[PDB]
Amino acid sequence: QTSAVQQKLAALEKSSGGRLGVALIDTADNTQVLYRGDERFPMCSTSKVMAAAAVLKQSETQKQLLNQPVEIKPADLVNYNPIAEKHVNGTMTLAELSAAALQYSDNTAMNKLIAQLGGPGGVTAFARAIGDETFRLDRTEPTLNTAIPGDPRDTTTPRAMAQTLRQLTLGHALGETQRAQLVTWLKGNTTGAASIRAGLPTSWTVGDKTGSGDYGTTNDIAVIWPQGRAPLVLVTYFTQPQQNAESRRDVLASAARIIAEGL
Numbered sequence: 001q002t003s004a005v006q007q008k009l010a011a012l013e014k015s016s017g018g019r020l021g022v023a024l025i026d027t028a029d030n031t032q033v034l035y036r037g038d039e040r041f042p043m044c045s046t047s048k049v050m051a052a053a054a055v056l057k058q059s060e061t062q063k064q065l066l067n068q069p070v071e072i073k074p075a076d077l078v079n080y081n082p083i084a085e086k087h088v089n090g091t092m093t094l095a096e097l098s099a100a101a102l103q104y105s106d107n108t109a110m111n112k113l114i115a116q117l118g119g120p121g122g123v124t125a126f127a128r129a130i131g132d133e134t135f136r137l138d139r140t141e142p143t144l145n146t147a148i149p150g151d152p153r154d155t156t157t158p159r160a161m162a163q164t165l166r167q168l169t170l171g172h173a174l175g176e177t178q179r180a181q182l183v184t185w186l187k188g189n190t191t192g193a194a195s196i197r198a199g200l201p202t203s204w205t206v207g208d209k210t211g212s213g214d215y216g217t218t219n220d221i222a223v224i225w226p227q228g229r230a231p232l233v234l235v236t237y238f239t240q241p242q243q244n245a246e247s248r249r250d251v252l253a254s255a256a257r258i259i260a261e262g263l
């Protein structure tokens with residue numbers, strides 16, 4: 001079947017010229033709304049949530065792990081390092097790296113999280129351990145954002161990412177203190193006001209993680225606390241056929257607005 005919401009999302013996608021993927025979980029009733037929910041999309045920096053969460057899981061058995069200093073060398077800097085560049089020839093703790101990766105989208109910080117987990121496959125292994133059979137991280141920053149159409153590397157589906165984001169932030173994939181820390185970090189994101197949040201009523205509270213890459217790829221994954229009702233989890237992924245396409249955060253906002261109107 002095609003619902004009214006799905007037909008609106010299809011119209012939005014048609015006008016946009018690109019390929020749109022949406023997954024909503026409404027935790028009030030556990031119902032789901034999907035659009036291309038089982039197609040693969042490049043995650044780009046939305047993958048930083050999985051890396052930070054994997055380190056939070058490690059910290060459940062190491063009380064001092066988040067305070068461990070990690071060296072930042074000049075050679076570690078990649079292509080977007082607003083926080084890590086201030087620490088070159090010094091150190092950042094794993095908490096600081098997690099916060100920088102999540103709230104500023106720092107790519108050097110992400111690479112330190114990946115290294116702490118033993119490489120991209122350590123992030124995938126954590127995903128499997130929490131029941132996500134779809135997520136795959138194959139590369140480090142910045143090349144995990146190449147976003148080439150048809151490339152399976154560094155992709156997931158909207159359905160899988162919404163389920164995982166729910167388990168991480170609202171369910172029991174992490175210990176209680178770690179879940180709360182992840183939610184605090186997401187709610188303090190600096191990069192998200194033009195994405196999912198721009199399509200929602202202003203009274204609603206949002207924590208989110210954005211992503212973008214080549215092929216005009218523009219992504220956001222969010223946990224949403226609407227005024228007076230149980231939380232929602234929403235994934236909006238968007239990618240375009242030409243390498244040099246411009247970012248389209250407005251398409252994510254428009255998808256979120258359609259979703260909110262259908263509640």
Ligand SMILES: O=C(Nc1cccc(-c2nnn[nH]2)c1)c1cc(-c2ccccn2)cc(C(F)(F)F)c1
Nearest residue numbers: 079080104105106142191192210211212247248249
């Ligand atoms: O840093 C970013 N993108 C990047 C980095 C390095 C090289 C190249 C590159 N290479 N060739 N063309 N661009 C592009 C980046 C872009 C954004 C954005 C904002 C507004 C509209 C579109 N996108 C937002 C954010 C953040 F972190 F604030 F969410 C980071």
Ligand SMILES: O=C(Nc1cccc(-c2nnn[nH]2)c1)c1cc(-c2ccccn2)cc(C(F)(F)F)c1
Nearest residue numbers: 045080105107142143144145146210211212213214
């Ligand atoms: O690293 C990148 N982008 C980035 C960095 C940090 C934060 C965020 C972010 N966070 N939230 N939203 N965007 C995005 C990146 C961008 C590109 C690109 C090319 C052409 C046009 C646009 N982009 C290409 C590549 C590579 F290496 F794969 F070719 C990497």
